[PDB]
Write a protein that binds this ligand. Sequence first.
Ligand SMILES: O=C(NCC1CCCC1)C1CCCC1
Ligand SMILES: O=C(NCC1CCCC1)C1CCCC1
Lengths: 193, 193
Amino acid sequence: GDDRELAILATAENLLEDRPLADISVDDLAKGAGISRPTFYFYFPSKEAVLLTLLDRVVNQADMALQTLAENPADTDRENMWRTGINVFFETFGSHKAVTRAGQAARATSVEVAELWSTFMQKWIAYTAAVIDAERDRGAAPRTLPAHELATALNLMNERTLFASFAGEQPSVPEARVLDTLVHIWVTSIYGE
Amino acid sequence: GDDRELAILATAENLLEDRPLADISVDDLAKGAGISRPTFYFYFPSKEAVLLTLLDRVVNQADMALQTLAENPADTDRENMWRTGINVFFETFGSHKAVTRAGQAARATSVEVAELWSTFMQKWIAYTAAVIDAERDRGAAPRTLPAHELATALNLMNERTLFASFAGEQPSVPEARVLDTLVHIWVTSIYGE
Ligand SMILES: O=C(NCC1CCCC1)C1CCCC1
Ligand SMILES: O=C(NCC1CCCC1)C1CCCC1
């Protein structure tokens, strides 16, 4: 039931650590999950749908963790408030690098992967701009750029820079320095006049 | 000679405006260039090599334009100096959107596209950090983050945000606002304490 399905998801996340989706077959997923090939098709329509579900779970997990933070103001300065919010994405996607990397490569070929990522990016950007606007209304941040365009560039910087660090791309910020690097650019660009 | 080769490059840039590389055939390139299929193979080994050359030309054109700017200090404030430097990439890649978009999609499948992009990104990042370090030595910028990690995140923010605007992705900064948006984040993060 849920257990056959979880096994197929866990097998897929395991195999994605060692190779691309294109080198994984339904048979591989089935075997690792302990079921036949036609039994697999009962739970998912294809290997692509397995990645879609893995991505959907990671993205919802980041999203629920951000909602938790939002409902629960951490008792600290502005710099540390931004750091804890960015750290949701650093720790959540950072704990699922193979899925992130496969989900990235799938954006170009899968409309459902592209729209899932786009829906949540819009949600996180709107939340970011709502926080910047709140900061400006309270007199803590100056009215510089439109809050929504600034939120957009900052979230896209994080998407690209986090990914680069997790993949070890050249060039990339080392993964042990990427949080401090991003928090500095967010705080100076939000609070700086 | 150069003219058959230029015609093939121009045909490819034309067709890439209306469809992906995967929907363009060697025959298409040949016909549009006025030559046969086997004659095409004399000039390039495949359609992929045609895109590689198109990308190589655009990237060298941005690079030569930045070198021109670097040797020729524009007589203006710090904000406008950064804006003119970013504008090299905005205008150069902005004038070749179909090639940019195809070159992006090819990074995932072509090692030569991946290494060309990576070589020049490292060069532009090193140049950026050299300028930040010069600014700090002169007392114009404070010593905050390591100049090279800050250069890295800013260049990756621009890569991702420029591309998003040129492709009209959702989310993206509108193309008429993307320069001001990026110059603000660069200036506040470089000069802000
Ligand atoms: O780090 C990121 N966003 C920062 C947050 C601060 C508060 C809410 C958004 C992006 C990385 C990829 C998706 C979102
Ligand atoms: O805009 C960019 N770099 C800004 C420049 C300011 C001075 C030299 C680098 C990136 C976009 C894609 C490649 C580089």
